[PDB]
Amino acid sequence: GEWRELRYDSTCERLYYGDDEKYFRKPYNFLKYHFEALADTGISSEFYDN
Amino acid sequence: GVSVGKCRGILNEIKDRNKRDTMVEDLVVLVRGGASEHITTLAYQELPT
User: Fold this and answer.
1) What is the DSSP letter of A8?
2) Which residues are modified to Phosphothreonine (chain B)?
């Protein structure tokens, strides 16, 4: 999932994605890596005036 | 001749005023799905648009 930074080619005017070296070998001791993505930004603001 | 005058005066006044007001606002976001830099820029907690 992290092989998505950037990749460009000026000679052929080819702009493509992170296809180079995109594979992660799982080290028997690991059941599964289960790539996923979730980003939850929670802001709790309570302004009180007395 | 007999003459005697009596005068008595008293004043009282009190004024009081009090005011209190508060206002609280919150905003929470929830995003699920996206690993590239797109979701990273979208994960900015700082304008829900």
Assistant:
1) E
2) 22
